[PDB]
Design a protein around this ligand. Structure first.
Ligand SMILES: *[C@@H]1O[C@H](CO)[C@@H](O)[C@H](O)[C@H]1NC(C)=O
Length: 246
C-alpha cells in the first residue's frame, strides 16, 4: 500500500508520496527509460490501496488499478464507493469486501462524466494540497454532487501527478494555496494515452512519433511533440499506458 498524510504535509513529503505511488505500480520493462505499465494483472494484485489522511487524521482508502492508474473506488469508514462502470464493478469483487455497505456513485470515473456531475469543468476547480485535504474530508460523507468535484481533485493530485512530473510540480507549488490547473496540466491529462502510445510506437520508428501530439506549454502556447527527445518524454511523463490498453 501507499500512504499520505495531509497533517504536516509539505512539497517534499508530497513528492515522496508521489514517488512511492509510482514505485508501487509494477512493470517488467522501461520504454525509453519510462516504466511501461503491464497490459493486465490477475486477481486482487491489480489494485493498489492508497491510504490518505486529512488534516484531522480521518482516512479514506482509495483503490487504484495498477495497469492504468485509474481510481476504481474508495472506502470511507465502513462504506465503499465505486464508479458506475464495468471496471469498477469488477474491482468491487476484490477490494473493500469487509465494508458494511457498498454504494455505486451515479457516474463513471471519466473526466467528462465527473465534470457533468460536479457542474463545472476541471479548468475552474482549484487543486493543491489544501484542495486534497478538502476532497478527502468530503468523500468521508456521501454527497454525490460534492463527491464528483472531490474526485476530480483527487484524480489530479494523485494519479495525474504520478503520471507526470510537471503535474506533481504544479501540486507542489500549490502546497499552501490552491489554484486552478494550468492549461498545460489539462493538456497532459488529456494526452496521456496518446503520448503513451506514440512513445511505444517510437520504438521501431527510431524514437520518432508515428503521429505528433499537440500540447499546450507552460507559457500557454501550442506545441507539437514529434519525437522522444522532447522534454515531455525525457523529463516529464513518468508511466506509460500499455498500448494493449489503447
Ligand atoms: C524532435 O524534437 C525536437 C525537440 O522538440 C525538435 O526541435 C526536433 O527538430 C525534432 N526532431 C525530429 C528529428 O523530428
Amino acid at each position: 500500500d501507499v500512504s499520505f498524510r495531509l497533517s504536516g504535509a509539505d512539497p517534499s513529503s508530497y513528492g515522496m508520496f508521489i514517488k512511492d505511488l509510482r514505485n508501487a505500480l509494477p512493470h517488467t520493462e522501461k520504454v525509453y527509460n519510462i516504466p511501461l505499465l503491464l497490459p493486465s494483472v490477475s486477481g486482487a494484485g491489480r489494485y493498489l490501496l492508497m491510504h490518505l489522511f486529512n488534516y484531522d487524521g480521518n482516512t479514506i482508502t482509495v483503490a487504484v488499478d495498477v495497469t492504468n492508474v485509474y481510481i476504481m473506488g474508495y472506502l470511507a469508514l465502513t462504506t465503499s464507493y465505486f464508479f458506475n462502470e464495468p471496471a469498477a464493478d469488477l474491482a468491487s469483487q476484490y477490494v473493500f469486501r469487509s465494508a458494511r455497505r457498498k454504494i455505486t456513485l451515479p457516474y463513471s470515473g471519466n473526466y467528462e462524466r465527473l465534470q457533468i456531475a460536479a457542474g463545472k469543468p476541471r479548468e475552474k476547480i482549484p487543486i493543491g494540497l489544501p484542495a486534497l485535504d478538502t476532497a478527502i474530508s468530503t468523500l468521508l460523507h456521501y454527497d454525490s454532487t460534492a463527491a464528483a468535484g472531490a474526485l476530480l481533485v483527487l484524480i489530479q493530485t494523485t494519479a495525474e501527478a504520478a503520471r507526470f512530473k510537471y503535474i506533481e510540480q504544479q501540486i507542489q507549488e500549490r502546497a499552501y494555496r490552491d489554484e486552478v490547473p494550468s492549461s498545460a496540466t489539462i493538456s497532459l491529462e488529456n494526452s496521456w494515452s496518446g503520448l503513451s502510445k506514440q512513445i511505444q510506437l517510437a520504438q521501431g520508428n527510431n524514437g520518432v512519433f508515428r503521429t505528433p501530439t499537440v500540447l499546450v506549454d507552460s507559457k500557454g502556447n501550442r506545441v507539437q511533440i514529434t519525437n522522444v527527445t522532447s522534454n515531455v518524454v525525457t523529463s516529464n511523463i513518468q508511466l506509460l499506458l500499455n498500448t494493449k490498453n489503447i
